[PDB]
Amino acid sequence: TEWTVDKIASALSVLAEEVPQNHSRLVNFLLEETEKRAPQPRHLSKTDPFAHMKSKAIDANPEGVPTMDVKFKQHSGEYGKSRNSGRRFQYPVVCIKPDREPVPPYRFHHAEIRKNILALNSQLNFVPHKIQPRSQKIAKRAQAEYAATLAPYLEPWLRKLNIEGCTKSNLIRFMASQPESDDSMTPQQKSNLLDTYSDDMGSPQAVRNASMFTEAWDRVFNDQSKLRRVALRDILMLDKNVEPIFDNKRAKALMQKVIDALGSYTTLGCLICFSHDCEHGEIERDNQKRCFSLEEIGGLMPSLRRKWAAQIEQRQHPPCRNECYRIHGTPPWSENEVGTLEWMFATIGYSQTLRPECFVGAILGRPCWDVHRKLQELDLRLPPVEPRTIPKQKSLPWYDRRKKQLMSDWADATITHEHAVRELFAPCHHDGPCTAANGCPCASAGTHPVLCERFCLCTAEECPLKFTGCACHSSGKTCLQRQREGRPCICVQLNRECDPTLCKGCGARERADPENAYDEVLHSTGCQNVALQRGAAKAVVLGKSQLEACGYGLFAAEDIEEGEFVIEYTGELISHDEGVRREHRRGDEENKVSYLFTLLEQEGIWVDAAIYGNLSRYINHATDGNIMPKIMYVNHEWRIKFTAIKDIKAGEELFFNYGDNFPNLTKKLVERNRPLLVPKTTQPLFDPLSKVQLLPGQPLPQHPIDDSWLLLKHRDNLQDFIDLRPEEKEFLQEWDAFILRRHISSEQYLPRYFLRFVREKADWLVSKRSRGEEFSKLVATLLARRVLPERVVIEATQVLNDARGRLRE
Amino acid sequence: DSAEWELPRLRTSFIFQDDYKSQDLAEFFDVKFYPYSPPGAPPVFAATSKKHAVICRLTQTTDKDANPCEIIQLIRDDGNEANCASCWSKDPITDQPLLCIAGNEGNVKVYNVTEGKLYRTLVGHGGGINDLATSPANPYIIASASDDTTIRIWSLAPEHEKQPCVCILGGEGHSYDLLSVAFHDNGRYVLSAGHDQVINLWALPEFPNEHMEIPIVIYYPHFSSSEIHNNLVDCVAFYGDLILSRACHEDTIVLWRIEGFSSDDPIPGPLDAPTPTDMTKQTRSYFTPSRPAMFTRLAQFHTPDCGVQFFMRFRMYHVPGKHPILAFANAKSKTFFWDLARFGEYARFMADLKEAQQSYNGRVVVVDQGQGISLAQAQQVHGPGVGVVMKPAWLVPKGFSRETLQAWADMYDLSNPVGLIKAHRSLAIDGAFVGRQVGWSPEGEWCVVVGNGNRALIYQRWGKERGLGS
Ligand SMILES: C[S@@+](CC[C@H](N)C(=O)[O-])C[C@H]1O[C@@H](n2cnc3c(N)ncnc32)[C@H](O)[C@@H]1O
Ligand SMILES: [Zn+2]
Ligand SMILES: [Zn+2]
Ligand SMILES: [Zn+2]
Ligand SMILES: [Zn+2]
Ligand SMILES: [Zn+2]
Ligand SMILES: [Zn+2]
Ligand SMILES: [Zn+2]
Ligand SMILES: [Zn+2]
């Protein structure tokens, strides 16, 4: 009845005896089950295939044939005593030669990716022969395994001991109150425990009992003379309501209602590719991800306020088939149903050609006059937005954004075009002009100003630094490197590809669309500065390099005229330190094999093609190469393009001068104390996947890219957020699986892809109400950034209204 | 009667001429018995050295001085490859035996052994091959583990002649040289392991009965852990649904299981695998049913004096109607056996004896089994006053002494997953010997151990020798 540390310790020792007993029972049970399940031998031949073959031992009574010796001893008895010294015999040898040579060497399965993918930082757990001492490795593993053995016993033993206050939850409360939980726990963690557990532990005896139980357990099971040992604290940390509090996998008047309603989408939604788990963003050392999202540029309100101000600063169509309030007008509403019209109302704003009523009534299964009735009885009031007055600003002498032209000192005045020295910053989200005084990073973060890009909240009307695209047009080819036209292509001058939206004269809009990638007529005029977005590579083929003791090389499979884009260098984007860990994890000397291409030196991003990438990873080095790499800015992605510097005939091997493109990070660290055919060539050529040898004049193998493994990782990355309800994950995952497959880089293509999604998933979206509600939060977010045209919201209203009418079945 | 319990003993040994000359650094790296002969046939094994495949047939003999091992085919790899891995298959048309041999150039040679010719070559690995295994469910399906960090699955079926690589286990599950590959008996789960200390379990799809222009690539294993051992792993295998694996510097073979894994469940598909979303997790599992635990260590067979050696392989004999025998040879001239059925029989004997010790307050008489005496005749020699417990004959002393019980517990107690089970038979080898591989004949009467110095040790049980013949 009245316990002591000794009495409970004594009792735990007796209960602990059932652990080895159960273990023996379990292993014996599993051994018996396995013996019973022994497999019958299969595919037996009906005759002994060796029956006709006799001993090949040579007789004393084989000329020219190679011969080997074998010496036999026979043994008997218990200790293997040999009967005598043995006897040797001569045997003829059948010599068989192989008919095929191995393919050139490689490490890992080399898989194709369409675009660069973003890697997590790995740990250095193995180095062929930063790191944790192996002794701590070994010891924690022993303790982990023992803790897992002991964990299932604690509640059964507690129930049998039945001591007042010795409760799994009271023991967690006691643990949280002990000093060890300051050097094991941080604020908000104690706050999360206090949510589930609180601090009251009951009677004085309940508190004394739990303390004695804890001491008595750490005395019996945490005797520090042992390697296998568990503190009770280590077992309670395994508890399903405690573990999540120590898992950092977390995504995150009227307006702060809406702000919180769209938090998942403002936080995760990519500004570039519109997906919620994707290849953009930055990875921190602990692998927490800073998404390239609205939160990077100040969240919902700075963009929404600007949309409202744009709406009232423009001073001066068919009604929905859901009993439209426009014809009519005026069941209890959930708070969810009300919130849904709250955020559509606020993000549609001061519009003329779009009203929430019809669309909210398409997302909720409600008639349009119903949500108009609820709209009017709730009388929602927007914040009033102040007339934004734009202060007159002097243009820059090196850049005229109206003529879209660089002039005079420009290469010395900006580092906009010098990607190797640029440091990356979140686009403008300030009020007022882009000056050092207002803290604008574009103007002042670097050694020089850079132009403001499409994601900065400034407008070309306001900001003298704002990029507005190139002025090029021509019935012939334009946006070329040294155009014979009167003035050059600002886009090309800045080492960027043309923007499908800002470059209105050159045909970028159509040529930067991958759905026109193989319209040779289209791409034979107009802008020739969209090749990475076009996504089309010259025909190439893998083979044995012509250089001796080089392994693979890459060969042209079609004639390539000088100046033509050839291929992109794709790979994993990694950090400097992840580059270094990788140089270690694979071995070392200058017999090494690097696929580590420098993308942004100063920012510290490398492209690693050692596992994932494309055929370009096989191009070998020459001083007098026939192609040239170049870093390009492509819609706020930086990418590696290869361009021909000579005419290259089909069958010729590609080379470029590696320069310092493939650095030795660790060595620099220690110092800082017309069908397409296989071409006729001399070298053997291989299918990149099967490594089957290719024969000249056969169809060039062109295998569609396998992305399913990549959609699964991105789905699982959203599943892992403890921050998101299942209704959120369901929809976010559906949208991401669709939009990731379209590899969007420009908002020019989003409305078409969006309309395609609401068409394909229309039946799915109206089958379950949380899906429609989540779909409407995405819409509200894209509308707030003025990135989804009001035209498409009206069409989705029809599409879903018609899908739900087809469901009434 | 006691025959069920007999373990092997050394019956014959041979040394093969050195073929990597130095004139003693050649080794047999592999030995495999042909598994597709009719029941009863003379067992035939191949012992692959670095340059030769020595094919022998074993025939039991009534003469102690006679030699049961006769060499029926001897093949040399006339190319530049040094080999260390082999596995058996069959011609899909003729049903002739095919011996596969792989090594350090990165190619599988397939030999038609009865006719002494090359059947074909399997080309495509990017580095040396260190293990091969045949699927127990399809004798035309072979898996190969390579320095190039991949597994490749090959088919010798006619429909795949023009491109025989049907599957590549790739992705990021492994990061350095693979040393071991094994098939589950269902032919659909594959285990792999090597220098990166990861053990991976992979689920194979069904492969089309027709030509595949490219292999199916698999990017995620379904179970993955680098935490069952703390060193490089060089041998892995299924024992039914349990796992047996071995690592360097540990002197143990570990028996363990994946929580939630059962070959009775449907085979999961490739999009069901777990992906490495958390980089600090060194174990992940599709199969997982307080925090679980995704594996459970069960027992450790003690395998002393392997030192720093690696690429040393055990082999379990597992056949319906016979006892399961685990055999492994170390690096200091010893060969170890465990009969897994002794575990259950010891535990029954200790439960029967602990029971009679209370029910009769100690007046308990212990009688050996395997006698003409049964728990009945032994009870009639006394009556209701004293308990009779039957003790297995192979349980030998040193009431019973402390040292006798401790010596029995050391060999048969399964109560501690972190314990060390001493071998049930430990046989010494003349001279300095390092085991590389063990193989068992279909009926389990022969056990062959091969290793350095091009030596084969041939153990037998259930022999028919009768009375010398010199
Ligand atoms: C991007 S990889 C090129 C593909 C490589 N040949 C292969 O088999 O995978 C670059 C590596 O190839 C080798 N390499 C490329 N060009 C070379 C050259 N001109 N001379 C010697 N080695 C070269 C070096 O090992 C270098 O690390
Ligand atoms: Zn993105
Ligand atoms: Zn309407
Ligand atoms: Zn600014
Ligand atoms: Zn800016
Ligand atoms: Zn600006
Ligand atoms: Zn232009
Ligand atoms: Zn342009
Ligand atoms: Zn252009």
Cβ pair A93:B52 closer than 8 A: yes
Q: How far apart are CA A341 and CA B195, in angstroms?
A: 59
Residue type at A63 in one-letter notation: E
In the block, tokens 């003329």 appear at: A352
- Kindly give, in sequence order, each residue whose CB lies less than 8 Å from that of residue A572, ignoring residues fewer than 6 positions away: A116, A117, A118, A119, A607, A608, A609, A611, A612, A613
Handedness of CA A531, A535, A541, A544 (dihedral sign): positive
| A-B contacts (CB, under 8 Å) | 334
**Number of other CB atoms surrounding residue B180 within 10 Å:** 22
Return d(Cα A197, Cα A200) in angstroms, integer: 8
For residue B448, tell me if it sits in a domain.
Answer: yes
Q: B277 CA to chain A: closest CA distance, Å?
A: 6
Asked if B418's CB is within 8 angstroms of A108's CB, the reply is no
- What is the rounded CA–CA span in Å between residue B409 and residue B346? 9
CB interface of B with A, residues 17-56, below 8 Å: 17, 19, 34-39, 41-42, 44, 52, 54
Shared-domain flag, residues B224 and B350: no
Kind of pairing between the strands at A637-644 and A565-569: antiparallel
- Partner B, chain A 685-704, Cβ-Cβ below 8 Å: 687, 689-692, 701, 703
Query: Around Cβ A259, how many Cβ atoms within 10 Å?
Result: 16
Is B168 in contact with B152 (CB distance < 8 Å)? yes
B470 in any annotated domain: no
Q: How far apart are CA B27 and CA B450, in angstroms?
A: 8
Query: Strand runs (DSSP E) across A3-78, as ranges?
Result: 67-76
Domain count, chain B: 2
Quote the tokens at residue B387: 């308990």
Q: Which one of A620, A623, A658, A665 would you pick to mutate in the ligand 1 pocket, going by the greatest count of ligand atoms within 8 A of its CB? A: A620
Ligand 6 center from residue A1 Cα (angstroms): 76
For residue A746, the CA-to-ligand 7 centroid distance in Å is 17
What is the Rg, in whole angstroms, of the alpha carbon atoms belonging to chain B? 24
Q: Is residue B239 part of a domain?
A: yes
Task: Please say whether the beta carbons of B363 and B457 come within 8 A.
Answer: no
Q: Cα separations (Å) of A601 from A280, A660, B293? A: 18, 11, 43
- Tell me the DSSP string of A771-784: HHHHHHHHHHHHHH
Q: Is B66 on the interface with A (CB under 8 A)?
A: yes
Residue A692: φ, ψ to 5°: -65, 140
H helices, E strands: number in chain A = 27, 25
Residue bearing the CA closest to ligand 1, atom 19: A621
Handedness of CA A425, A429, A432, A433 (dihedral sign): positive
**Residues near A704 by beta carbon (within 8 Å), at least 6 away in sequence:** none
CA of A512 to the centre of ligand 7 (A): 13
Angle at which helix A154-161 crosses helix A168-177, to 10 degrees, equals 100
What lies within 8 Å, CB to CB, of A70 at 6+ separation is A88, A89, A91, B14, B15, B16, B17, B54, B71
Residue B9 structure tokens: 């003993």
In a domain? residue B468: no
- Which residues on neighbouring strands pair with residue B31, listed in sequence order? B47
| 3-state DSSP of A348-375 | HCCCCCCCHHHHHHHHCCCCHHHHHHHH
Interface of A with B in 111-130 (CB under 8 A): 111, 120-123, 125-126, 128
- Using a CB-CB distance cutoff of 8 angstroms, which residues of chain B are in contact with residue A575? none
Chain A residues closer than 8 Å to B38 by CB: 44-48
CA distance B358 to B454: 57
Q: Which residues of A touch B213 (CB under 8 A)?
A: 690, 701, 703
A594 lines ligand 1 (CB under 6 A): yes
**Residue carrying the six token digits 């010259």:** A538
Query: B279 contacts in A (CB within 8 Å)?
Result: 120-123, 287
Q: Which of B125, B290, B417 sits opposite A23 (nearest CB)?
A: B417
Closest alpha carbon to A350 in A676, A786, A731: A786
Question: Within a 10 A sphere around the Cβ of A578, how many other Cβ atoms?
Answer: 20
- Distance, CA of A453 to CA of A297 (rounded, Å): 13
Q: Return the sign of the alpha-carbon dihedral for residues B260, B262, B264, B266.
A: positive
Residue A421 CB neighbours (<10 A): 13
H-assigned helices in A17-110: 18-36
In this complex, do A26 and B242 lie within 8 Å of one another by their Cβ atoms?
no
Contacts of A755 (CB under 8 A, 6+ apart): A792, A795, A796
DSSP label at residue A699? B
Instruction: Return the HEC string of chain B.
Output: CHHHHCCCEEEEEEEECCCCCCCCCCECCEEEECCCCCCCCCCEEEEECCCEEEEEEECCCCCCCCCCEEEEEEEEECCCCCEEEEEEEECCCCCCEEEEEEECCCCEEEEECCCCEEEEEECCCCCCEEEEEEECCEEEEEEEEECCCCEEEEECCHHHCCCCEEEEECCCCCCCCEEEEEECCCCCEEEEEECCCCEEEEECCCCCCCCCCCCEEECCCCEEECCCCCCCEEEEEEECCEEEEEECCCCEEEEEEECCCCCCCCCCCHHHCCCCCCCCCCEEECCCCCCCCCEEEEEEEECCCCCCCCCCCCEEECCCCCCCEEEEECCCCEEEEEECHHHHHHHHHHHHHHHHHHHCCCCEEEEECCCCCCCCHHHHCCCCCCEEEEECCCCCCCCCCHHHHHHHHHHHCCCCCCCCECCCEEEECCCCCCEEEEEECCCCCEEEEEEECCEEEEEECCCCCCCCCC
Using a CB–CB cutoff of 8 Å, tell me whether A108 touches chain B.
Answer: yes
Identify all chain A residues contacting B240, using CB atoms and an 8 Å cutoff.
33-34, 37-38
Strand partners, A613: A112
Could you tell me if the CB of A586 is within 6 A of ligand 1? no
* Residue B465 within any structural domain of the chain: no
In this complex, the residue of B65, B107, B320 whose CB is nearest that of residue A38 is: B320
Q: How far is CA B444 from CA A68, B30, B316, B465, in A?
A: 30, 18, 10, 17
CB A701, CB A694: distance < 8 Å? yes
- Tell me how far apart the alpha carbons of residues B124 and B122 are, in angstroms, rounded to a whole number: 7
Instruction: Indicate if ligand 1 lies below 6 Å from the C-beta of A545.
Output: yes
Q: Cα B108 to the chain's mean position, in Å?
A: 22
Select the residue from A108, A138, A158 to test the B interface by mutation, using most B Cβ atoms within 10 A: A108
Spatial neighbors of A661 by CB under 8 A, at least 6 apart, are A597, A598, A629
Burial A618-651 (b: 16+ CB within 10 A, else e): bbbeeeebbbebebbbbbbbbbbbbbbeeebebb
The single-letter DSSP state of residue A173 is: H
Residue A78: closest CA among chain B residues belongs to which residue?
B9
SS3 A621: strand
Report the SS3 class of residue A56. Answer: coil
The verdict on B205 touching A (C-beta cutoff 8 Å) is no
* B321 and B383, same domain (yes or no): no
Calculate ∠ Cα A560-A566-A568, nearest 5°: 175
Q: Residue B180: inside a domain, yes or no? A: yes
Residue in chain B closest to A708 (alpha carbons) equals B271
Which chain B positions have a beta carbon within 8 Å of A28's beta carbon?
343-344, 347, 414
Q: Following CA atoms B265, B271, B277, B280 in sequence, which dihedral angle do they give, to the nearest 10 degrees?
A: 40
Backbone angles phi, psi at A735, to 5 degrees: -65, -45
**Binding site as annotated, residues of A for Zn(2+):** 270, 273, 278, 280, 320, 324, 358, 368, 428, 430, 434, 440, 442, 452, 456, 458, 463, 470, 472, 479, 489, 491, 498, 503, 506, 527
Residue whose C-alpha is closest to residue A512's, from A543, A554, A469: A469
Strand pairing category for B252-258 and B295-302:
antiparallel
Q: Tell me the residue length of chain A.
A: 809
What is the identity of the amino acid at A306? R
Which residue owns the Cα nearest ligand 1 atom 3?
A618
Q: Are residues B362 and B436 in the same domain?
A: no
CB contact under 8 A, B78 and A96: yes
Name residue, tokens 């750490």: A218
Distances (CA, A) of A92 to A63, B24, B76, B166: 10, 21, 10, 37
Dist. CA A404 → ligand 8 center (Å): 9
Q: Which domain holds residue B263?
A: 2-341+420-460
The answer to the question of residue B316 being in a domain is yes
Please state, in angstroms and rounded to a whole number, the distance separating the CA atoms of residues A134 and B109.
40
Same domain for B289 and B383? no
CB of B272 within 8 Å of a chain A CB? The answer is no
Q: Which ligand is nearest to the CA of A544?
A: 1
CB A87 within 8 A of CB B108: no
Give the phi and the psi of residue A250 in degrees, each rounded to 5: -135, 125
**Chain A nearest C-alpha distance from B75 (Å):** 5
Residue B152 lies in a domain: yes
Greatest extent of chain B over all pairs of C-alpha atoms, in Å? 79
Give the method of determination: X-ray
Picking from A85, A107, A134, A239 by the largest number of B CB atoms within 10 A of its own CB, the best residue to mutate is A107
The answer to whether A552 touches A542, Cβ cutoff 8 Å, is yes
- Binding residues of A for S-adenosyl-L-methionine, by number, are 552, 592, 594-595, 620-621, 666
Distance CA B96, CA B90 (A): 5
Segments making up each domain of chain A, as ranges: 5-21+141-246, 707-807
CATH code where residue B106 lies: 2.130.10.10
∠ CA A366-A371-A377 to the nearest 5 degrees? 145
Please list, in sequence order, all residues whose beta carbon lies within 8 angstroms of the beta carbon of residue A616, skipping any fewer than 6 positions away: A554, A567, A568, A569, A570, A609, A642
Number of neighbours of residue A801 by Cβ within 10 angstroms: 22
Q: Which residues of B touch A100 (CB under 8 A)?
A: 107, 121, 123
What are B190's two structure tokens? 């594959």
Question: What is d(CA A191, CA A237) in angstroms, rounded to the nearest whole number?
Answer: 16
From A529, A551, A556, select the one nearest A540 (Cα to Cα): A556
Considering the domain architecture, whether residues B314 and B225 belong to the same structural domain is answered as yes
Q: Which two tokens stand for residue A103?
A: 């393919």
Element (H, E) at A556: strand A552-556
- Residues of A within 8 A of B343 (CB-CB) are 27-28, 31
Element (H, E) at A189: helix A189-196
Separation of alpha carbons A806 and A809, rounded Å? 6
- Residues B358 and B241 reside in one and the same domain: no
DSSP H helical ranges for A504-558: 508-511, 531-534
How far apart are the C-alpha atoms of A721 and B48, rounded to whole Å? 52
Which of the 8 DSSP states describes residue A403? T
Which ligand has the minimum distance to the alpha carbon of residue A512?
A: 9
Same domain as B190, residue B161: yes
Contact A42 B137 (CB under 8 A): yes
Say if residue B152 is in the same domain as residue B294: yes
Taking CA atoms, what residue in A is nearest to B39?
A44
Query: Residue A433 C-alpha to ligand 9 middle, in angstroms?
Result: 29
